[model samples]
Target: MRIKGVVLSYRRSKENQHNNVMIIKPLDVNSREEASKLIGRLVLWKSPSGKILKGKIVRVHGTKGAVRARFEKGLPGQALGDYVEIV
Candidate 1:
């Protein structure tokens, strides 16, 4: 599925050491394994100003259904709770 949203907060995992945690609105999945499988894939989110933001899924934050992804550019601060679509 393709989802769009603003990045709320992100942090690299200290325990796993290479994983990342990203808190976003309109989370698209219900399964941790499904979310984990998305690691290394590209994620797209649309901003309020009609710009598109892209990020790479780096890892899954444990089994909490949270995803960690990195973008080529930093996400805008106003992106929080923005609209998202799952395709």
Candidate 2:
């Protein structure tokens, strides 16, 4: 689905070690129903080194329709404000 989303913000769970959450806002996904459909889908973005850091859409953030993802490790800070791809 070439769906494009922007990294909106980070989420916090604090000290188990890594900061593990990402709040994302996909283009055109403006409703809870739209965000709900993204859950369980894989989300990925490319870092400058060409590494593909992929995360899973775990949940929705709020009435604004932003979604949340949990990745293996914290994503590079460079990814903040960058666009992400949904596959």
Candidate 3:
């Protein structure tokens, strides 16, 4: 199954919005039940160079089912506003 989503933005702190922390809204998940189910799932985004950037769902971002993901490589500019697949 294709667990697709789009990047909303990154988690913000006092001085900067860290790219390594991502907030995503999934196309298929719409509630806390579905949101909790995504934790630990792998997240993937293909860059312009066609190299897939990989990440993982660490937690739910909001009550409405948005998710929070952490990417080891950090999110490049190309990844913002783009879609990701959870596999």
Candidate 4:
């Protein structure tokens, strides 16, 4: 099944931000337990240029259902707040 997810932001520390790893919130997920079930799932994001970026769900972000996806390349700034497909 393909689940729709929102690209909330990039994974970041207090002073640094990661461009290849993004924080995504699945539309149907709301709790950490449910988020854990999606670990290792494949994620895809398409750019306006018709290029598709592939990523994998690595881990849950926090107490919330947000997940961290590490992509093959750094995503552009426009990817923020965009939609991703969780496959």
Candidate 5:
């Protein structure tokens, strides 16, 4: 799977016990079924160090401002203002 979006913001997860918040745009899929296909999948983001940070999509927050996802890995601290391309 692949997705393109700009990093909007991040926060601690309230639903999952092992993930962090990640708000992104252009969610590629819109319906619950399509979103379900992406659940538990890896979400990739490019860090300022030019390395890809791997994260697992635990669940979706909602259909609001950009799709909010929860992941396990801590994006490099420098990724707060970076654009990410998930694949």
Candidate 6:
């Protein structure tokens, strides 16, 4: 089964943008407990034209309901603030 989510942004520090990783928000998830349940799960992002990009959840980003996902290659900026799926 697949679940819906939104791509938030690249994992950024003050000095650098972690290109191969992104922040994600799985729908209806609002606690650290909820987010951690998806650790190590696979996620998918698709381009409007049908290209599929794969990613995996590494850990919960913050306590307020977001997590980080690492991908094979750096996804384009177009994917930021877009929809993604957890599978």
Report the number of the highest-TM-score candidate. 2
lDDT of each: 0.58, 0.75, 0.72, 0.71, 0.63, 0.72
- What root-mean-square deviation over C-alphas does model 5 reach? 4.0
RMSD values for the candidates in order, in angstroms, are: 4.9, 2.5, 3.0, 3.3, 4.0, 3.1
Clashes of 1: 1
lDDT of 2 at 42: 87
- The list of candidate 2 runs beyond 4 A from truth reads 11-14, 17-19
TM-score computed on alpha carbons, candidate 4: 0.73
Every model's TM-score: 0.59, 0.78, 0.76, 0.73, 0.61, 0.72
- What residue pairs clash in candidate 5, if any at all? none
lDDT of 4 by residue, 1-87 (tens): 566877776754445454445677778777666778768777876777777788788778765568767765767765677788854
Best first by TM-score, ranked: 2, 3, 4, 6, 5, 1
Per-residue lDDT of model 2, residues 1-77, tens digit only = 37787788776667776666777888777877767866788887767767778888877777557777777767775
Residue 61 of model 2, lDDT score: 73
The alpha-carbon deviation from the true structure for residue 37 of candidate 6, after best TM-score superposition, in angstroms, is: 1.6
The clash count of every prediction, one per candidate, is: 1, 0, 0, 0, 0, 0
Q: Model 6 reaches what TM-score against the true structure? A: 0.72
Per-residue accuracy of model 5 over 10-86 as CA lDDT, tens digit each: 87666866556667654356666666665676667776667677766555655433456655557665457776666
| Candidate 1 global TM-score | 0.59
- Where model 3 places Cα greater than 4 Å from the true spot, the runs are 11-20
The candidate with the higher TM-score, 5 or 6, is 6
